[PDB]
Structure 1
Amino acid sequence: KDDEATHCRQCEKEFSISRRKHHCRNCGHIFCNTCSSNELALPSYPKPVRVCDSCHTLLLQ
């Protein structure tokens, strides 16, 4: 659960009309699409949800 971000938490590029904001369902931070291209089954959720690369790696171990 998080709002008001300016840059992608991961690659740090700046969000704008040309760069959509997305949420990682595992850590709640805001990421650009390129840094959150994976979906995986996450306990609190019914269908696979979007996660950032870090969380993706964390949960695949």
Structure 2
Amino acid sequence: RKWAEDNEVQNCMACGKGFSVTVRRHHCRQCGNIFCAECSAKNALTPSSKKPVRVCDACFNDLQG
């Protein structure tokens, strides 16, 4: 519900491509947006949980430091 768990996305937010059998879907755990394998191709380690959380390219560098 509060998180974008394929509830009805089927479309990245940035590239906004229609997720298909070729491209997968990945949402940013920080902002909470759905990004395609190309937009979500960046992860960063946060001191909040000591683990690399999946996030888009921007937030990845915005939270990595």
| TM, length-normalised to structure 2 | 0.70
The superposition leaves residues 2-60 of structure 1 with CA deviations (integer Å, 9 ceiling, x where unpaired) of: 132122111111111221111211112111111111111232x3411111123224325
Report matched runs for 1:30-45 at 5 Å: 30-42=34-46, 43=48, 45=49
- Share of identical aligned residues, percent? 45
Give 3-state SS (helix, strand or coil) of 1:35's partner: coil
CA RMSD of aligned residues (A): 1.8
Segments of structure 2 that go 5 or more residues without pairing to the other structure are: none
Matched with 1:50 is 54
Name the structure with the higher strand share: 2
Matched with 1:28 is 32
Q: Amino acid of the residue matched to residue 40 of structure 1?
A: A
Segments of structure 1 that go 5 or more residues without pairing to the other structure are: none
Give 3-state SS (helix, strand or coil) of 1:34's partner: coil
| TM, length-normalised to structure 1 | 0.73
Asked if 1 retains the 8 angstrom alpha-carbon contact of 2:42 and 2:54, the reply is: yes
